[PDB]
Design a protein around this ligand. Structure first.
Ligand SMILES: *[C@@H]1O[C@H](CO)[C@@H](O[C@@H]2O[C@H](CO)[C@@H](O)[C@H](O)[C@H]2NC(C)=O)[C@H](O)[C@H]1NC(C)=O
Lengths: 111, 131, 183
């Protein structure tokens, strides 16, 4: 299965603000450990999108934001173009299994 | 520049064991930790293994525990992953992903950095359990 | 001994111009660093504590600045982004220890403490241990700016927008960074 629950497919109209929520139990975010975000096109390997809940590496634009509120985190994109219709995953570290568990994997669309 | 290549794709029968090999190219290989993640086709990612700066500390997920071992070499700039008793579910692509540099805690206890994520990823090869 | 003045400073500085200190031929106790406080964070990369009995005190620099709580874990080796490529960059090298403690009520007021800044728009991202000073326009694309701050070319700094009702990761963490070397 998957440890961290996120919705399987979230739609999107261009120019809007789309949320992707990742709820984890009280053993991965409840211990204070951080939640990251990845970006995986089909046919290739993912790239790092957000680490440390709000940061961004060199290469991604200013539209990729995130936060961490309690036991759940969320990502938001504003002003989306047709370039980014790939999957996103949330990653955290727990002490229930002491493993770097992932999320279920959402799916974004452009209409 | 910085990239990771790997080898060891396979066609695997009921009972077999296998080894994976992921080379490294461009950056300081002897300092940063290394992660292994896999992804069954049809579902998302899944964390497999990690090994520290020197190799003294390793961790394993629940779906891979008891059948998996790991080793690295700073000489040939390689990373290994041998795998025992491959069952009927583990057909997946296997990524070798660069981790983050470990840190020293108070009172002199070396441990992995647990906050961060995996920065740069390779290509991944596909083991295929079958009949 | 001499770095008890770097922890209680009434005003630190922003990350686009921090403040080093050559510490010369004096006693450094180093047991006030570990066993200091529970709520401090003591990541150390270069060498471990309870080992540093060597004759190390050859110009130890203690950097210090202020950043967001979600931005503390950008200061590590590597870890590129907005504040580690244009403001203050660490190498993959002998950076000793990084300490980051919370400034809950030292600066966070409701109208905003404006003297904390960060340079977001810079060409040719930084070398390690490099400080920037100049405040001119970025020249991103086309037509040259003789200095008006008109269009497609931004003011290089940016404000900080303080408020007490922020998250845990946006109230400021006062961060110090040491350094280790020899002769
Ligand atoms: C400077 O700041 C340091 C902390 O970084 C102070 O050390 C602690 O200070 C508190 C009082 O604020 C004491 O209760 C602790 O016992 C001190 N701990 C240690 C390990 O010394 C230091 O006293 C401050 N100095 C001043 C007030 O100038």
């Amino acid at each position: 299965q998957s440890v961290l629950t996120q919705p399987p497919s979230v739609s999107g109209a261009p120019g809007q603000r789309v949320t992707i929520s990742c709820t984890g139990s009280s053993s991965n975010i409840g211990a204070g450990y951080d939640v990251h975000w990845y970006q995986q096109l089909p046919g290739t390997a993912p790239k790092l999108l957000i680490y440390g809940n709000s940061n961004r590496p060199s290469g991604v634009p200013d539209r990729f934001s995130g936060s961490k509120s309690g036991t759940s985190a969320s990502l938001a994109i504003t002003g989306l173009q047709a370039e980014d219709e790939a999957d996103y995953y949330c990653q955290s570290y727990d002490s229930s299994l002491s493993g770097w568990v992932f999320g279920g994997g959402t799916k974004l669309t452009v209409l | 520049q910085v990239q990771l290549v790997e080898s060891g794709g396979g066609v695997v029968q009921p009972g077999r064991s296998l080894r994976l090999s992921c080379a490294a190219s461009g950056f300081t290989f002897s300092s940063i930790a290394m992660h292994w993640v896999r992804q069954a086709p049809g579902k998302g990612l899944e964390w497999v293994a990690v090994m520290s700066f020197d190799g003294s500390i390793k961790y394993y997920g629940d779906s891979v525990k008891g059948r998996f071992t790991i080793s690295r070499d700073n000489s040939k700039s390689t990373l290994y992953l041998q795998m025992n008793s491959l069952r009927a579910e583990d057909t997946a692509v296997y990524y070798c992903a660069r981790g983050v540099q470990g840190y020293y805690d108070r009172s002199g206890y070396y441990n992995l950095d647990y906050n961060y994520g995996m920065d740069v990823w390779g290509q991944g090869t596909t083991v295929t359990v079958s009949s | 001994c001499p770095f008890d003045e770097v922890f209680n400073a009434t005003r630190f500085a922003s990350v686009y111009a921090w403040n080093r200190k050559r510490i010369s031929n004096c006693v450094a106790d180093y047991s006030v660093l570990y066993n200091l406080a529970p709520f401090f964070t003591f990541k150390c990369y270069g060498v471990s504590p309870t080992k540093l009995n060597d004759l190390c005190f050859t110009n130890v620099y203690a950097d210090s600045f202020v950043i967001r709580g979600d931005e503390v874990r950008q200061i590590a080796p590597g870890q590129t982004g907005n504040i580690a490529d244009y403001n203050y960059k660490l190498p993959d090298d002998f950076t000793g220890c990084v300490i980051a403690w919370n400034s809950n009520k030292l600066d966070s007021k409701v109208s905003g403490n404006y003297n904390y800044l960060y340079r977001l728009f810079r060409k040719s991202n930084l070398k390690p241990f490099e400080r920037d000073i100049s405040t001119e326009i970025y020249q991103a694309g086309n037509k040259p700016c003789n200095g008006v701050a008109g269009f497609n070319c931004y003011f290089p700094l940016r404000s900080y927008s303080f408020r007490p009702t922020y998250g845990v990761g946006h109230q400021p963490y006062r961060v110090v960074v040491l350094s280790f070397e020899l002769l």
